[PDB]
Amino acid sequence: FNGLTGTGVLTESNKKFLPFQQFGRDIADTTDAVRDPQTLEILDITPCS
Amino acid sequence: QCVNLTTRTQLPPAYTNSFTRGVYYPDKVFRSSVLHSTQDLFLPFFSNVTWFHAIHVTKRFDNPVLPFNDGVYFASTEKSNIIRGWIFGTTLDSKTQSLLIVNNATNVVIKVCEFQFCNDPFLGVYYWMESEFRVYSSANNCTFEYVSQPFLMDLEGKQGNFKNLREFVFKNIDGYFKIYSKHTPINLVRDLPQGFSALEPLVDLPIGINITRFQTLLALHRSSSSGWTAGAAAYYVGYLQPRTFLLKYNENGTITDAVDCALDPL
């Protein structure tokens, strides 16, 4: 996603994600969400394994 | 045209306290139910800010050119379309670059395009259509012009007693140029109220100018050098400083409150 390389499962999420915010992060400063550039939908990332 | 509108009765020095205001969103990242510490150019809590009054109750056209330092907090909590834009330039006399920002409630004309500013550049609507447009003499060299207009960032339409609490933050760090902005309805009389407010980097424009000094463009009412009106202005200037702030994010991803880790031992 716009250079945000990573491995995991993308799932539709309920995160509010105010319009200016684009990435979203957890306490460990690891991106656990993204905004899809085509459609402005929030997909949280749950790692596999 | 460019007129020598003097109306200069030097106002006495005015100083007020900024309280817990002037704090913006550091990055475009959604954080929920966490506290984040960020080192950036913020307005120190309970700092001293300058309150120019461009009122006519006391005819004062308060348009001084003040330094930029590290960034400008501008709480233009005025009435309908009084202060419109801002000029950011080291010399602002067409010798060097001087980026001009004008909204005029309809468009957005951010242009580096070093202009020949004659004395005091200002806007104005004639007794109504906007008429005073000669803030300069010539465009000289017109660099990156940003001919796109997002929307009228002033967001006028509210009336009362300084009801439209409008706040802007101008930042120029190395490259780029950030303009954060928040609007809040408050009554009070003229001062900055209590509470916390911050909402998005309104407009980010990559310019890279020296931006050493700055000033503001003031709209007026043609009935001319003395026959005008000022309404009620709230010219507010605060200089940012590099501080560390501990911002708090609630569960729906908005900054609720923050602290400045340089004010008091607590």
Ligand SMILES: *[C@@H]1O[C@H](CO)[C@@H](O)[C@H](O)[C@H]1NC(C)=O
């Ligand atoms: C980008 O184009 C696709 C079709 O190719 C469209 O579905 C999508 O909405 C577009 N994105 C934006 C932000 O306009």
Ligand SMILES: *[C@@H]1O[C@H](CO)[C@@H](O)[C@H](O)[C@H]1NC(C)=O
């Ligand atoms: C500005 O306020 C500070 C406290 O915030 C005070 O120490 C200082 O003297 C004030 N300056 C002026 C010029 O009133």
Ligand SMILES: *[C@@H]1O[C@H](CO)[C@@H](O)[C@H](O)[C@H]1NC(C)=O
């Ligand atoms: C934006 O609107 C103002 C209204 O005064 C007008 O003068 C200006 O030319 C407009 N900008 C463009 C690019 O048409």
Ligand SMILES: *[C@@H]1O[C@H](CO)[C@@H](O)[C@H](O)[C@H]1NC(C)=O
């Ligand atoms: C204006 O810009 C042009 C184009 O980059 C440049 O060649 C010129 O030296 C600049 N200055 C003047 C005074 O024309």
Ligand SMILES: *[C@@H]1O[C@H](CO)[C@@H](O)[C@H](O)[C@H]1NC(C)=O
């Ligand atoms: C231009 O920018 C430099 C670097 O920030 C600054 O120190 C300097 O004062 C500016 N130059 C002039 C001539 O004002």
Ligand SMILES: *[C@@H]1O[C@H](CO)[C@@H](O)[C@H](O)[C@H]1NC(C)=O
């Ligand atoms: C919670 O998110 C909703 C989205 O509908 C929003 O209306 C509300 O203001 C948020 N809560 C807070 C405390 O900001």
